[PDB]
Amino acid sequence: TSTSPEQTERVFQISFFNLPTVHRIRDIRSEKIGSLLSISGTVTRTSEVRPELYKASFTCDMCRAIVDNVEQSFKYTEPTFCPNPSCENRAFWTLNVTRSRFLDWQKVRIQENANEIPTGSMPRTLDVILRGDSVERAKPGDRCKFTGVEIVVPDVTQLGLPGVKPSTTEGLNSGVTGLRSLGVRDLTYKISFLACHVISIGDQEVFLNSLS
Amino acid sequence: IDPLREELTLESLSNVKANSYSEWITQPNVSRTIARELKSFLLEYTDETGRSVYGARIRTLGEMNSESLEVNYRHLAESKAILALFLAKCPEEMLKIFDLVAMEATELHYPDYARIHSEIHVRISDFPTIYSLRELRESNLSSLVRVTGVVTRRTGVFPQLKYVKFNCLKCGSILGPFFQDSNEEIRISFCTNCKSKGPFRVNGEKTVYRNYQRVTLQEAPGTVPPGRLPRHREVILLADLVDVSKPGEEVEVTGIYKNNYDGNLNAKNGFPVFATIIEANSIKRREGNTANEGEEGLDVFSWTEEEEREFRKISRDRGIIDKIISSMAPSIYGHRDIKTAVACSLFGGVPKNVNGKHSIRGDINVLLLGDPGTAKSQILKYVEKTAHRAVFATGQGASAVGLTASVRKDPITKEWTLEGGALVLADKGVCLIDEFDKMNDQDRTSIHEAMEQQSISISKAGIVTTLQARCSIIAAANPNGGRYNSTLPLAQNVSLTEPILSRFDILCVVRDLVDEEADERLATFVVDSHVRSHPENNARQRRLQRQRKKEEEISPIPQELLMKYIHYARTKIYPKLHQMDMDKVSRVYADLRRESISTGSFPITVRHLESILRIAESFAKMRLSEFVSSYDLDRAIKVVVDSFVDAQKVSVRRQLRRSFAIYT
Amino acid sequence: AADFSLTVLRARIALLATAIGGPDYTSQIDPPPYKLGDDCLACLKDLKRWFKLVDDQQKRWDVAMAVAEYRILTDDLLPILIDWENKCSLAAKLAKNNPDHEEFRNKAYYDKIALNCLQLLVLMTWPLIVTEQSSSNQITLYGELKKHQLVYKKTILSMESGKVLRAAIRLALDVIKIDRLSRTPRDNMVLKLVLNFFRNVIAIEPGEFTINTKKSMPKKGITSIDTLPPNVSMDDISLNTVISSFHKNKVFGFLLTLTSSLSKEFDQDFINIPLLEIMFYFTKDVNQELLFPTSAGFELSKLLQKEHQMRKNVIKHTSARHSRFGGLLSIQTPDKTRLTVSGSQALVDEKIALQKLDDSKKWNKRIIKKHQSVAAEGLPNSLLNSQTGKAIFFTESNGKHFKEFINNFIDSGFNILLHSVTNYFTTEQDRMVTLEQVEYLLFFAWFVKYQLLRSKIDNSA
Amino acid sequence: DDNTEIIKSFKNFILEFRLDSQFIYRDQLRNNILVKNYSLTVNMEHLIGYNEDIYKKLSDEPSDIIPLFETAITQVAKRISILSLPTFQLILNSNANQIPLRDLDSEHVSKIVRLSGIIISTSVLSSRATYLSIMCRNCRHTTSITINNFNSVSLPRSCLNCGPDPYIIIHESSKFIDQQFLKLQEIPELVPVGEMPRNLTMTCDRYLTNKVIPGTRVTIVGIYSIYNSVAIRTPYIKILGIQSDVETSSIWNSVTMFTEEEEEEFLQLSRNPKLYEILTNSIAPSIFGNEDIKKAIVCLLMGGSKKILPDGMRLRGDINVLLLGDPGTAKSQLLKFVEKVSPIAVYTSGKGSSAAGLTASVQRDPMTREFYLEGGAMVLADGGVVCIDEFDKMRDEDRVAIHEAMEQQTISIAKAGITTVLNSRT
DNA sequence: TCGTGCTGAGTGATATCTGCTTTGGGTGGGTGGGTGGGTTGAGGCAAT
DNA sequence: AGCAGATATCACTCAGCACGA
Ligand SMILES: Nc1ncnc2c1ncn2[C@@H]1O[C@H](COP(=O)(O)OP(=O)(O)OP(=O)(O)O)[C@@H](O)[C@H]1O
Ligand SMILES: Nc1ncnc2c1ncn2[C@@H]1O[C@H](COP(=O)(O)OP(=O)(O)O)[C@@H](O)[C@H]1O
Ligand SMILES: [Mg+2]
Ligand SMILES: [Mg+2]
Ligand SMILES: [Zn+2]
Ligand SMILES: [Zn+2]
Ligand SMILES: [Zn+2]
């Protein structure tokens, strides 16, 4: 019919499963951050699906130069140096959505199963993030088994966000300092989970084709 | 030859040579080619009839002083596939070009139309694909989408700056005006001349303003999975689109799926997540139109000039009223007395305001008190489908303030506010209350003021206001004990009180009696209807033709044509009484009162004389006649007298019928 | 003026691109076949004229940017060459079936179009060099044009598994079909064009990240140095992909045939230098030790053990308790003065205490490094500036193919190529530019060292 | 330059207009000055007749032209009253087509429009600045600012080294005016299909304040402007003239406003030997019979006399009427007519009413977090008639709240620390 | 090929000035949010 | 009052040459 001009490279996703051990939410520790492990819990709440910036592309305000493939951290990121020798622009950039790449993003809230809960104790809660095809695969009330990587989530606020003014434990939760970004502020951390695999534990012609 | 003025061809236009669709469309030559092709499509497109659809649409647009030209997506897709693909993929620039080419087709018909409306907007009617707010993903970004939902929240109409002009704080030079995106703010960082890091005071000698409104679209209860939380989106309504959707309604939104940077979102989530919105292109009122989803166009009750001529031709026929009555609920075998009442209620009367001091209701209320299996709920469903604005409610499912209007505290402003109800939503429409007898007393009592004064009075939390409720009420009820006792008076068969009964213009009592011939005929008709509706029993044209053939068997008038006819008659026809037999009506009223003096009989008051006049007006309206004739008055008298006679007991029914034989 | 002229230039080149031709969607056969326009040859000639009269004589590069914007290459020239090559292959198969069978019409016109397409390909793929005298327009468009060249190379090596290489080989073999005495200067020019095309394809690589130095670097600093286009990865343009494509399309055989009959059945003046440049660009970034080393698992285990030892040595510097434990140390100098240090390791050890004392110091003595951009001299990235240890990670099959090709060349024609190059260059020493000197020296050194290593490993060769 | 010419043209219009042999506006200005009424009411038809160019200039840019007209009026007043006075106010009257309140949009921005509605809320008088005396913190430089209340002004950003915003207002030497805020709703008959009534914010200055009470239909002439509370502006109306069918001044004051020609029309009518029959026939002409109920309604409208005894005891002077009857008696129509004819009246449904609806309601301010008292039908209908339809439908709880209102004509509130006794003479 | 200045402009660096904004409370708002705090009292509504 | 960004004026390194050794 016609030539499609937009054909970008595929974003492959690797999903693991069948791990030898399944952990509980209460068994999560900081020694396993950045490790591949499986957890089990009951889904409590599910957020909506949002587009997440993955590979941003920017254009220079001054000379109209183009900067592409800007990897994004937990916060919004912009270039600092123009690729144009002549141009002096450092801190003046505009995002280009046409050339940018976005990914599906969902936040899932889970809590430990009732049977695993110590008697007379409040359930423990954790945040699970789903991306790509794993989105909308867990519904509230289900008992799911997630396989993924334990991560630590900073306070993006502190780090400095465009247009965002920055800012249990009785003031004893003091963050880390000394960073350039954090001129007089401190950085706190939060344990989260990035899941790459979800398993929920708990007309004639069309039908005939399905059967063996 | 100037290269910027050269143009390509359609097959060459199909071949894309740019890095993206937007870049291909924005090129001068490609833009000129697209504009030329769109103009050709608008000017030369012909339907099955052979006349230019969009020429007539433009004529009507200019006649009504409107600024919105409706274009059917299917027509464009068949005529120009490549242009339809471009519109689907890059709605923005394609819509800009389409708007330009439309003010040159409007201006073709009305040369000086620019003095009325500066710009004309193009609205897409039937997008082939329909999405749910759950199904939206990142692949739909910057592309036309069609979603359905519930208008939970609404803002007030604000003037938004079309063009923004900036001036340097320091230098003082005033930058040229810039296009204001609907989605997010426009700012200037780098000055072309001054080259100053500092901000610009925003000032302008003359600014053009644009209507702006925002709504909170929510998944409809019907479509959301059972027991799961709904999803919502924010819809932005620009000029000419404001106030078209009212809170609590069900709508289908055609718009552009857009994303923008949100700092607080990022902050809260902890990930680089972009906020999403919908830029409304077209709105279709889906409320009470579930069974009308098989039609095309933004409004199924709207009409064209040819359809108006067809309506006139149909009306000129002598037996128009009989056909209209027969076309009411064709799948229901008989009940020609429940169909006549329903038709009269649907058409309604003419409200009157004598010298600005006396207000007279102009709507007809109907009550169906009958046996369990006499096809009352189906009649109510048909009335809901046919009426322009209809609301359906159940007995106990309706509260005293769910009907009428209710008071809440506003989440945003933390102040008491007013919300509408069933009645409000049914303004200039019909309110259907199934299981009327099962209603709570409190609930029932609510509608008393609304059913006669056509207004709702609220005095709560410092809110002193009066609303407009010009809605007709058709209700279905079951007699006390679950079955009518024809021996006892009407009053003893129902628990309703005198005022509520008097407020009902027409009473239709339905009895289920065992009779060989009646049972045989009803069973035969029901079996034939069931066989007719079996799912198994161009492609679109063939489907429409077979549907028309099936419909022709049981209805003399097409259903869609009937709905358009009813809407046209209600909107454009206001019959008046000038010649009429005063003595006949006076004697009928006196006789009705004398016969109703009996204890336990159906109440009779001046309301029923006014109802006789209203039914005469409605019968006159059914023919698109500007004046009530004697035949219509006689028919109304016959209807009312027959209802009154049927409401009586078995013992005295013969005497009553013999006495009133003169009028009927 | 300048902006309006740029707009007119872009519009005219866009019209040319749309007029060259495109796929014919009318035919039901899928994927659709490319169809030539009415004035394909005229369009190509006009494009070449634009290149000559605007890009070079006026010292600008707007024509190349306009050509890259509208995808003239990836959509018109490469499909044309591939279709012509497929037609020639079908004709050869038919001749095999029956030599008298022919399925060609307007063969001369098709060959003319193919030759013009190859010439334009060489023009667009020619190396880009920025000098001190380069105009402002040339300086400003360096990075964008380099990115477009990267895209061109990726498409050339990927599309149809790289059949345009086979098309160029066929064009060269057309010249080879006629005897050396019968070879006209045009044929030698075509051969040089093919060799230059191969050299350009091998040579292209990511450019440098140029930053203005007017202002001292901000508090933010350098984010990243990325020159790759949006949808291009290093895997597409690496020498591994080049080796794969060349092996698949039998480019190595053609080059070996040319270099084995060198100076005997060919005119060496045209062919000696292009071969030398091709081979230098082949072997400039390749370390010869890697060529003479599952084993991957064994090496991974060894590297993991090495990292484990490094981490174990690092552990002694970490405190068992958390940071806020708060141990304070006082260390006595030879004179009675006490210095303060913090950390458990300070209390438990003395060398750690002195190391921390040193480390805590704020003042730094300035270090000035004399850095020369290689792009300034026009040279490519090679062993001279590549960081020591930078290894080209070949696959087993690709490594075997590359080793076989190099071995065959060294056993066939390295002697003759070196002799011819040395004669030609010593005859014309003064005209040498820096690039030619570096090229000759590096080629000689690389091949001599590789032969030494192979002789050590294998007693035969 | 052009401003001086505009002022001269306005002065010439004031000093030269005449339709027969009376200079209407000159004499009107003199009479207004005599009684310390610094204003002037101008009929726009006269302005159009005198010179269409002046009307065109006024309509094109009202916010920039009206102040020049006020300055011209002030100059003419000084010429006519002082033998060699704050800025005078301009009040406009027009007969242009009334735009529905809901039809006000972007197209009507910064233009003179006429519309009618119902006032639902009024604010407490505030203070605006007209003449400001300022002084610089560092060098103590005295300066003055003259401010007009028409918005398209701030303290100087730079002194005349001194830091940004160096001027501080001296209050004892400044002059202020009165300002008020009103909320205008749309007429119930003009509301579109199935829509809630719409509210509009409006402002009045000086002599247009304290002119309307909540619940009274009014006609407003003003400018449809916008103010920035980022890509949007909040619409509002700048009142230039108020026209109402109820003499609010004569209702809240013992003072009575009636022209001599009126007073003598009402005396002649009273002299009629059979005025009772005329008034009885004049109520609900479209309702047959019910003569006794019509007489009762006449008596209720007229009301009795209230006496305050020396000991402090007060005797009610209002008449209440109840209609208990069968359906179809036309009681609701009589109630609607009574609500229409009485100078002050509120029509309420018993069903749709509450205890807090019909007396007064404790309401917390969202911002100040302070509790205030809003008013209900029996405070909004003070001095008038309350038509309580469907009396029987009213809950007991709701009903019981009416006794003191009916008999003692007062509302006693003891809620959220608010102890007050309101007045409800209905 | 060491020693001692004289020249020198380049490449820094660090000692040195120019503009927010804040607390919390409506003397910044509701096109910054309500999971960053405030917050007890009255009022209307549905299930009971 | 404190904090983060920026300007501009402060030195220091490698650069290279003349004399004589
Ligand atoms: N004497 C009359 N003259 C004119 N119209 C009348 C008369 N009596 C009744 N009507 C009409 O009868 C209808 C009765 O409705 P209305 O609401 O006025 O009744 P109501 O007496 O308040 O009864 P309900 O108790 O049922 O509310 C109205 O249309 C009224 O115009
Ligand atoms: N007169 C009739 N003609 C055709 N179908 C009928 C008739 N009466 C009843 N039916 C059938 O019987 C059913 C009656 O159910 P319904 O009318 O909904 O109950 P109710 O009368 O209590 O509302 C319907 O599904 C309808 O198809
Ligand atoms: Mg039913
Ligand atoms: Mg009533
Ligand atoms: Zn730049
Ligand atoms: Zn400037
Ligand atoms: Zn000063």
Short mmCIF file of C-alpha atoms in Angstrom, two decimals, chain B residues 154 156-161 180 185 209-213 243 246 354 356-359 389 400 413-416 418-420 424 427-428 442 445-446 448-449 453 455 457-462 464-468 470 498-499 502-503 605-607, chain D residues 102 105-106 109 183 185 188-198 226 230-235 282 285-287 326-328 332-333 336-337 340 346-349 351-354 356-358 361 363-364 366 374-377 380 389-390 393:
data_model
loop_
_atom_site.label_atom_id
_atom_site.label_comp_id
_atom_site.label_asym_id
_atom_site.label_seq_id
_atom_site.Cartn_x
_atom_site.Cartn_y
_atom_site.Cartn_z
CA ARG B 154 -16.34 19.55 34.65
CA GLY B 156 -16.17 26.42 33.84
CA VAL B 157 -15.52 27.87 30.43
CA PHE B 158 -12.40 30.08 30.43
CA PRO B 159 -10.95 32.34 27.71
CA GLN B 160 -7.48 31.03 26.66
CA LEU B 161 -4.90 33.11 24.80
CA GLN B 180 -0.35 28.48 22.39
CA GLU B 185 2.77 26.37 28.37
CA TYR B 209 -8.99 34.54 22.93
CA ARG B 210 -10.29 30.99 22.62
CA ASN B 211 -12.90 29.08 24.57
CA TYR B 212 -11.39 26.45 26.90
CA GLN B 213 -12.83 23.71 29.10
CA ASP B 243 -20.67 22.79 27.23
CA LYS B 246 -22.72 17.75 30.82
CA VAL B 354 -50.73 33.01 29.51
CA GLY B 356 -46.56 35.65 31.57
CA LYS B 357 -48.49 34.94 34.79
CA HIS B 358 -49.98 31.44 34.29
CA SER B 359 -47.84 28.42 33.42
CA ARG B 389 -33.24 12.10 26.02
CA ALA B 400 -35.65 10.74 46.63
CA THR B 413 -13.51 24.30 46.34
CA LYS B 414 -14.83 22.71 49.57
CA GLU B 415 -18.18 24.41 49.11
CA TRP B 416 -21.77 23.20 48.84
CA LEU B 418 -25.87 21.32 43.29
CA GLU B 419 -26.06 18.14 41.21
CA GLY B 420 -28.71 17.00 38.85
CA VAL B 424 -32.76 16.89 35.26
CA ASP B 427 -35.19 17.62 30.59
CA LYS B 428 -37.30 17.87 27.43
CA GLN B 442 -40.40 9.03 50.25
CA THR B 445 -43.33 11.69 46.81
CA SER B 446 -40.32 13.46 45.35
CA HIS B 448 -44.89 15.41 42.87
CA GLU B 449 -43.64 18.94 42.18
CA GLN B 453 -44.85 22.38 37.98
CA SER B 455 -39.55 22.55 38.22
CA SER B 457 -37.05 23.56 44.28
CA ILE B 458 -34.04 23.01 46.55
CA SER B 459 -33.46 24.73 49.92
CA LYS B 460 -30.44 22.95 51.48
CA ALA B 461 -27.12 24.06 53.03
CA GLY B 462 -27.79 27.67 52.02
CA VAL B 464 -31.93 28.47 47.42
CA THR B 465 -32.59 27.73 43.76
CA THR B 466 -35.23 26.45 41.35
CA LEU B 467 -34.36 24.18 38.43
CA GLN B 468 -36.17 23.21 35.24
CA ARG B 470 -39.63 19.57 31.71
CA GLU B 498 -55.21 10.51 44.82
CA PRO B 499 -52.61 13.20 43.91
CA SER B 502 -54.40 12.50 39.21
CA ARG B 503 -51.00 13.63 37.94
CA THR B 605 -60.02 17.01 37.98
CA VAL B 606 -59.28 19.95 35.70
CA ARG B 607 -55.94 18.23 35.12
CA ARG D 102 -24.30 31.59 29.10
CA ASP D 105 -17.50 33.84 25.78
CA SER D 106 -14.17 34.79 24.24
CA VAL D 109 -13.92 39.95 25.89
CA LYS D 183 -22.49 36.85 42.27
CA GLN D 185 -26.92 33.76 38.35
CA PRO D 188 -34.27 29.96 35.38
CA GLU D 189 -36.24 30.34 32.13
CA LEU D 190 -33.07 31.10 30.13
CA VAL D 191 -31.06 28.07 31.31
CA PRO D 192 -30.31 25.58 28.49
CA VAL D 193 -31.58 22.00 28.49
CA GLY D 194 -30.44 19.89 31.43
CA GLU D 195 -27.86 22.35 32.76
CA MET D 196 -27.18 23.80 36.18
CA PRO D 197 -27.49 27.57 36.50
CA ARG D 198 -24.23 29.42 35.91
CA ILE D 226 -10.59 38.94 32.69
CA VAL D 230 -1.22 30.06 33.52
CA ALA D 231 -2.71 30.01 29.97
CA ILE D 232 -6.20 30.96 31.35
CA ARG D 233 -7.97 34.02 32.81
CA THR D 234 -10.94 34.10 35.16
CA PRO D 235 -13.85 36.01 33.59
CA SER D 282 -56.07 41.26 39.94
CA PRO D 285 -56.78 36.20 36.73
CA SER D 286 -56.39 32.78 35.07
CA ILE D 287 -57.87 30.90 38.07
CA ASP D 326 -57.75 18.08 47.28
CA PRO D 327 -55.68 17.75 44.09
CA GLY D 328 -56.53 20.07 41.23
CA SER D 332 -49.61 25.63 43.68
CA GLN D 333 -50.53 28.10 40.94
CA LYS D 336 -46.47 30.75 42.25
CA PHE D 337 -48.48 33.90 41.53
CA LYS D 340 -44.28 36.46 41.41
CA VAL D 346 -39.05 32.80 47.79
CA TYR D 347 -40.76 29.68 46.45
CA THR D 348 -39.64 26.51 48.24
CA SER D 349 -40.80 22.90 48.27
CA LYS D 351 -39.92 17.94 50.20
CA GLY D 352 -36.78 19.55 48.99
CA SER D 353 -36.07 21.57 52.05
CA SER D 354 -34.11 21.17 55.31
CA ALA D 356 -30.53 24.36 57.72
CA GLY D 357 -31.88 25.26 54.31
CA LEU D 358 -34.84 27.31 55.60
CA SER D 361 -26.44 27.33 58.08
CA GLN D 363 -20.50 27.15 56.98
CA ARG D 364 -16.63 26.96 57.42
CA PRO D 366 -12.21 27.02 53.13
CA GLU D 374 -25.16 31.81 55.35
CA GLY D 375 -28.88 32.44 55.06
CA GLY D 376 -31.86 30.42 54.01
CA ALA D 377 -35.26 31.03 52.57
CA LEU D 380 -33.51 35.69 52.05
CA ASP D 389 -45.35 24.20 48.76
CA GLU D 390 -45.90 20.58 49.68
CA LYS D 393 -44.07 16.33 52.72
#
